[PDB]
C-alpha cells in the first residue's frame, strides 16, 4: 500500500520493469559490439566507440525508467539478463544492421508502452516517454539508417577499403 | 591464431571471462541496492548514492578486464547475467552485510586469478591485478567494515534514529 | 666487492647486460626502418615517424636498464651491436610484420628475465620489469596488431592506394 | 574474528608488527644522528638535515605499515623501542657507514617479508612492499653508496677540509 | 669542556634528557591510540585524527627540547622508549581519560623542571618552558577536560549513539 | 636510378655512411662513459651528465648525416657498431683525455670528408659540413682542452679532492 501511488496501474508498473530488462539487454549487446571492434583482428576504433557510447545510453535509459518507477510508487523488479545474440559481429555493415534491428525493437516496446499508458489514461507516463525516449529513438534510428546507406555505398568491389574509410571519415 | 597473443594461457583467458561475468553481476546487484534505497518507503538518499557509485565501479572493473583480454589477444565471451540475490534489501545494516559478502567473493575471485597467473608464469596478469584490483578491493572492504561498525553502534534501542543519523552524518 | 649490492645475483646482472644489447639492437633496427621510409623512393612520412619514435623508446628502455644495473650495484658491460637484419624494408606491411616479430622477441626476453628474477627471489627486479616494461610491451604489440589488421584490409586490389591511405589517415 | 580479514596470515601479521618496530628503531637512530651533527662541537648542518629527514621517512614507513595492518584486519601491537646503538657518531664517514648498515638491515627485513608473503600466497602484501618500500630502499642505498664514495675521496691528507667541503657542496 | 656552555647545570641537562624520553613515550602512546581508533572494529576517524595529531605535537616537543639542549651546550642522551601502557584503548571516554592522565604527567614534569631551573637560577630555561610548553599544556588539558564533559553527557542510556555523535559533531 | 640525385658521387655517399658509423660509435662510447661515472664506486654526477649529453649530440649528428644522405638521393647503409674501447674509464682526467682523442678522430673524419667533397666539386656537401659540424667540433675540442687544463691543475698532491672540486664547481 504505497502512500504516493496515484493513477499508476499494475499493468504499466509491470511493463516498465520489462522495459528496464530490454534496455539493460540492449546495453549488454552494445558492450559486446564495442569490444568486438576493439579486437586486434577487427581493429575499428571509431566503430568500437560508436557502440560503447550506445551501451552507456541504453544503461541510462534503464536508470531513467527505474527512477520513474520509484517516483510513481511502483516497485523495481529485476530479472536475469540474457546474453547478446552473437559472440562475433562480422563487418561494420553486419553490426549496424543488427543495431538498427535492436533499436526498432526498443522503439516498438516504447510505442507499446505508450499505447498501454493511453489505454490506462496515464498522462504522466505518456509525457515521460514523449519527453525522454520517443524522439531520441527516432533520431538514433535515422542516424543508423544514414550510416547504413554510407556503408553500403562504400562496399563497391573494395570492401575492406570502404570499411576503413567509413570508420576514418564518418565515425 | 592470434598474431599478438604471447604467454597468455587458455586457462587465464577463460577465468578472465568468468571474472567479467562476476563483476557485471556485482554491478547489477549494486544497481538493485541503489534503487531499493530510493523507494519512497525506504528513502535513504546517501545509502542509494553509496551503492549506485559501486555499481559504476564494478562495471568499470569489468570493462578493464575486457580491455585487457583484447590487449592480450584473448576473446571476450559473454554469458547470461543472473539477477541479484534479493529483490528487497532490508535495513542499511542488512545491505552493508550483503555488500561485504559480495566484495569478499570478488576479492577471492581476484586472488584465485592471481594464483592461476602465478601457476601459469604470467607476470603481466599478476601486475595487472596488483595495479588495478587488489588494493582497491582491500580499501573497499575496509571501508565497509568501518561502516558496519558505525551502523551497529547506532542500533541501540532506537534503530530508525540510528539509521537516519548514519545516512545523514556518514554517507 | 660492491658496498650497496644486496640480493642481486650474477645471473640477473648478466642477463640485464644482455637485455641492454637487445634493446640497443632494436633501437638500431628502428633507426634503419625510419630512414628507409624517408627515402624519396619510399616517402611515407607517417611510417618514418612511427619507427623513429620507437628507436627513441628502445634507447630509453636500454638506459633505464643501465640505471637500474648501477642502482643494484651491478656493472654495465657493453658488447658490439649487430646491424639490423635488413637494409631495405619493403612495404609498410612488411615493416610492421618485422616490427611485431622484433617486439615479440623483446617481450620474450623480458619474460625470461622476470622468470629468472622469480627463481632468484629478486622482487625488486620483478617490480622493475612490471612497472616499466611488461605493460608497455603488451600495449605496443596490441597497437601493432591493430595496425597490421588495418594495413591488410587496405591491400585490396589497389595496394599503393591502401599504403598511402593508411599513412595519411592512421599514422 | 575480524569481519574484513581475508587471506592474511598470522605469520604476516606478526612480521608486520616486527617491521614497524624496526622502522621506529631506525627513525630513532636517525633522530640521534641528526642531533649529534647539530652539536656546537660537530656543527655540520647539512649532515644534521640529511639524517633528520631520514628519521621522518622511517617514521612514515612505520605508519604506512600500521595503516596496512588495519586495512588487512590485523592488529597493531607495539613493543619497547630500543635506543640507538651509539650515543656519539664520529665523523660523517662513520655516520654514513652506520646508516648504510642500517638501511641494509631494513632492506633485508623487507625482502624477508616479501618472501613470507610469497610463501603465504599474499599478493596484496607483495604489491604493497613493491609499491612503497623496495624501490625506495634501493634508491636510498644507492645514494648512500654515492655519498660514501665522495666522502672517502675527500679524506686525502686533509680530513677536516674534506668533511667541510662535502657538507657544503653535496649536502 | 663545552666552549658555549654557561650557567647550565648538569642537573638541568639530565632532567632535559629525561623529559625528552617522557615526550617521545607520550608520542608513542598517542600513535597507538590513533591506530586503535582506525581499526575496522572501532572505526572512529575523528578520534584517530585527534590522537595522531597529538603524537606529532609530542614528537615536536621532544625535538624542541633536543634543540635547546644543543643550544645550551648540553649533550643529548637517548634511552630505551617503553611501549604504551595498553594495547587496546576501550571507548573514546576511556581514551580521553588516559590522555588527560598522560598530559597531567607531562605538565608535572614541566613544572618540576621549571622548579629545578628556578633553584639553579637558570632564567633561560625558565623562559624556554614558559614560552613553548606551559601554556600549551594548560590549553590542551582544558580542551581535554571540555571533551570529557561532552563525552560523559552523551553516554545517557545510548552509549554507542553518543560515541558516534561526539566523533561526528565535535571531532 | 634515383630521380633526385644530382652531383652526388658514390665516393661521398660511401664516406657519409662510414661517418654515420663513426658518430654512432662515438655516441656508444659516451653512453658507456656516462654510466661508468654513475657507478656508486665512482659517483661523479656532473661527469656522468657531461658524457651523457655528448652521447645525445653524437647520435644527433649521425641522424643529420642520415637525413642529408636521403636529401641527396644516396642510400643509408648501416654496419655493425663496435663496442667502446674500454669497459672502465678511470679518473675524470683519464676520461677527458679519451674524449678529446675521440673528438680529434671525428674532426679528422669531417675534414677528410670535406676534402673529398672539394675534390668531387660538391659544394652542397661542403656547406653542410661547414654549417653543422666543423665549428661545433672546434668549439667542443676547445672546451675539452679548457677542462683538461683545469683538471690537471687540480691534481696537486690531493687528487681525490681535485676531482671532487672540478665536478662540483665546473661540471
Ligand atoms: Cl492497476
Ligand atoms: Cl546520454
Ligand atoms: Cl540467451
Ligand atoms: Cl594455454
Ligand atoms: Cl571509478
Ligand atoms: Cl539467479
Ligand atoms: Cl649470484
Ligand atoms: Cl618515452
Ligand atoms: Cl649481424
Ligand atoms: Cl594464519
Ligand atoms: Cl616522505
Ligand atoms: Cl638497546
Ligand atoms: Cl652543574
Ligand atoms: Cl605543532
Ligand atoms: Cl613498559
Ligand atoms: Cl660517382
Ligand atoms: Cl643538440
Ligand atoms: Cl671492438
Ligand atoms: Pt564520442
Ligand atoms: Pt520529464
Ligand atoms: Pt559521491
Ligand atoms: Pt597497468
Ligand atoms: Pt609523434
Ligand atoms: Pt620503479
Ligand atoms: Pt631538505
Ligand atoms: Pt599501494
Ligand atoms: Pt586536523
Ligand atoms: Pt624562545
Ligand atoms: Pt645539462
Ligand atoms: Pt644547412
Swiss-Prot record, chains A, B, C, D, E, F:
One of its GO terms (biological process) is iron ion transport. Fe cation binds at residues 53, 56-57, 60, 63. The keyword Flavoprotein does not apply. GO terms for molecular function: ferric iron binding; ferrous iron binding; iron ion binding. The modification N-acetylserine is found at residue 1. The keyword Metal-binding applies. InterPro entries: Ferritin (IPR001519), Ferritin-like (IPR012347), Ferritin-like_diiron (IPR009040), Ferritin-like_SF (IPR009078), Ferritin_CS (IPR014034), Ferritin_DPS_dom (IPR008331). Residues 6-155 form the Ferritin-like diiron domain. Belongs to the ferritin family. This is Ferritin light chain. It comes from Equus caballus. The lineage of its organism: Eukaryota, Metazoa, Chordata, Craniata, Vertebrata.
